[PDB]
Design a protein around this ligand. Structure first.
Ligand SMILES: [Cl-]
Length: 123
């Protein structure tokens, strides 16, 4: 029940961060301010969903954690972002996996990044 409060502290901090700034290296960040803010909000929404789960459940199951992840990412239309921005969203959501102790996204994150892209390529 102590781990429960820690994860929540991680999520609260994570929720308040800008996840789409330039990393100094090869990622430049989301330039459209309206879009970046809109994206941080979507991330904040998923973070807040996980918090609600841990508040109602001492030890959430892998399946529970995975559904919150899957529902959080499905809220973002991949056809509205460029490749670099989509990759940053995936990296950002990978951090959730580490936080909640979930090993995999069951291929959900890759399908999100390259799904519509490969579909349009084959079309
Ligand atoms: Cl993964």
């Amino acid at each position: 029940q102590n781990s429960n409060s820690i994860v929540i502290q991680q999520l609260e901090k994570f929720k308040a961060q800008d996840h789409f700034a330039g990393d100094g290296q090869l990622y430049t960040g989301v330039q459209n301010s309206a879009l970046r803010m809109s994206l941080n909000q979507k991330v904040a929404d998923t973070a807040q969903a996980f918090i609600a789960l841990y508040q109602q459940k001492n030890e959430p199951t892998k399946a529970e954690l995975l559904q919150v992840l899957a529902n959080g990412i499905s809220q973002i239309d991949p056809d509205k972002l460029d490749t670099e921005d989509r990759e940053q969203v995936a990296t950002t959501f990978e951090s959730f996996l580490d936080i909640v102790g979930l090993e995999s996204s069951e291929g959900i994150l890759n399908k999100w990044v390259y799904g519509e892209e490969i579909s349009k390529l084959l079309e």
